[PDB]
Every structure is written in C-alpha cells, then in structure tokens.
Amino acid sequence: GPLSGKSRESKAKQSLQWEKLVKRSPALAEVTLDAYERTILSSIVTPDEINITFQDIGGLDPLISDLHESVIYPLMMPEVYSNSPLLQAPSGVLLYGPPGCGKTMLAKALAKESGANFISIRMSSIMDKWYGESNKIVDAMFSLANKLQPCIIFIDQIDSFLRERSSTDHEVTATLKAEFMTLWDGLLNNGRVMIIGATNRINDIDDAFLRRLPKRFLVSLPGSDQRYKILSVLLKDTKLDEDEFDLQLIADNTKGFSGSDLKELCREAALDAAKEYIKQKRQLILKIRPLKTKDFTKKLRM
C-alpha cells in the first residue's frame, strides 16, 4: 500500500469522492479498488465542486462546439459513434495558448457538464520520495480511470509533467514519464479513458507526449467580438446602465486583453462603481449603482 494517503482526513476525502461517484454512477458500486487506486480517488473532481458551466465561457462558442462534437459526444455517447471505428474519442486532448484565455474554465466545464468521471491530478500527489511509489501511483491512476470507464484525467500545467526528456532528468521522474507514456498508449489499450491537458508552453511538452495529445485546441487571445462575449458573460447578473453603458467601446478598446485581464477590469469597475454602496454599508457594519461605460474608461487606456 502507498505510504501517502493514509491520513484520516485523506480517507474521509476518498470515501466522500467514492460516495459521490457511486451516486452519479450507480454501476460503480460493484467496482473494488486497490489501496493505491483509493489514494488516487482523492483527486477526483465531481460536478458539484465546480461552479463553472459551458454557458459561463464567452468568446469560445466555435471552440466549445468543436470540443463537444470531437471530445465529449464520442467519449460519453459511444453508441451513436459505434457505426465506424474512426469515430472514437481521442486518447488525449490538449488545451494550449496564452494564459487567461479560458483553458482552465474549459476544463472546469468539462468536469461539470461532460458527465465523465474527472481526475484532476496534481504532481504533488504523483511525486513520492519513496522508491517506486510514483510509478505505482500512475499505474493506479490509469487503472482507476479504466475502472470508471468514462473517465477524464486532467493535468493542469502539463508542460512540466510531460516535459521533454533528457539525461539530466531525475531517474524517478524519467521512469515516471516512461510509465505514463506506456499506460497512455501501449499494448493494453485503455477503455474510454482520455487525458486532457492545459498548458501555456506548447513547445515544452515532449514529442512522444504531444503525440499522445492528438486533439489540440488553441485557446488564443480573444478578438473584439470574443472580448465582447467575454465581457457580456462577466457582466452578467450585474446591473448596467440602460443608456450610458456601451459594451462595444470596452470590447474594442481592450486590445491585447486576456479573459483574466477582462475579469480584473470588470471587478475593478464594479468596485469603484459601488464604492458609494460600500461606504454606506461600512457605516452600518441602498442599491448598487448600475455599471457605466465611464467606470471602464477610467481603468482602461485609450
């Protein structure tokens, strides 16, 4: 058994994740897991833990539709695509581009809406100082993904785990990467198991690992209409002026703005728009003023 994951809170988290998985998939109750796979179970992300929905992603509607029709529907609905063997889901999916464009939000929406079991694994859980523990951890990760047959394995910042191999790499790290390469695509074919990765450095990933991510989505910087959609999504459920507000000017004048930059701009604009409301409530501890174009003009450069 793995020496890590023996904590009482760890066991409680594993039991909680297993109960959630069994509640979502009743057929999962007949599946028995190893101790290593039970340790991997703590990295499962349920739909509940995610508050991001595909409707909360703006400016990526063609990308969202392509991701659905090429990733989610083949993986989650194999009966429709069973007519031809070339209609299967890809073994790997890579979301790459400049930071802040929505790769992590797309991964969150995949965790929430796809319906596939999701493992958001981090390298802290994979790495272990003891000999041979990391290889068994990856083996358990792949075996658990095979057991929860429609599974997605997510590795955020995948350019570090799947970095280019070299002689200067650590022996345990190199063996771990080789084991991941073998289990990803080897003699024993996986089931409906997909490894989804998000990264900013596309060229830092090993060629043998980039080959295992054949479906690549370029979440690039948003355009003017894309920025308008992102701003409309961010400024949803937030009151805006019916006459003075002009979202087109904000979308056009945010040249070279990522989604996170637009989120910070919206947060700042809402803060200085409601400053009067926080001033009133701080004395106690009316209504928040609808957002105006001018509030965006002060914190933008024209």
Ligand X SMILES: Nc1ncnc2c1ncn2[C@@H]1O[C@H](COP(=O)(O)OP(=O)(O)OP(=O)(O)O)[C@@H](O)[C@H]1O
Annotated binding-site positions: 97-104
Binding residues among 100-139 for Mg ion as defined by CB under 5 A: 104
Please answer whether residues 75 and 116 qualify as being in contact, where contact means their C-beta atoms are separated by less than 8 angstroms. Answer: yes
Binding residues for ATP: 97-104
Least CB distance from residue 111 to a second copy, whole Å?
Answer: 6
Taking CB under 8 A as the rule, does residue 62 contact a second copy?
no
- Residue 219 binds which of ligand X, Mg ion, a second copy, none (CB < 5-8 A, kind-dependent): ligand X
Report how far apart the first and last C-alpha atoms of the chain are (Å, whole number). Answer: 60
What minimum distance in Å lies between the beta carbon of 253 and a second copy?
12
- Between CA 205 and CA 217 the distance in angstroms is 15
Please choose which of ligand X, a second copy, Mg ion, none residue 94 contacts, taking the beta carbon within 5 to 8 angstroms, the exact cut-off set by kind: none
Would you say 144 and 190 are in contact if contact means Cβ atoms under 8 Å apart? no
d(CA 157, CA 136): 22
286 binds a second copy (CB under 8 A): no
How far is 10 from 38, CA to CA, in rounded Å?
Answer: 10
CB burial string 205-230: b at 16+ within 10 A, e below? bbeebbebbebebebebbeeebbbbb
Question: Cα(176)–Cα(184) distance, rounded to whole angstroms?
Answer: 12
Return the CA Rg of the chain: 22
294 is a contact residue toward a second copy (CB under 8 A): no
Binding positions for ligand X, rule: CB under 6 A = 57-60, 99-105, 185, 198, 200, 208, 211, 219, 230, 233-234, 259-260, 263
Residue selected from 114, 125, 190, 293 as contacting a second copy according to rule CB under 8 A: 125
Q: Which is nearer to ligand X, 4 or 95 (CB)?
A: 95
Residue 283 contact, options Mg ion, a second copy, ligand X, none, Cβ 5-8 Å cut-off depending on partner type: none
Instruction: Please list every residue from 181 through 210 that binds a second copy, using CB under 8 A.
Output: 181-183, 185-189, 200-204, 207-208, 210
Interface contacts to Mg ion, rule CB under 5 A: 104
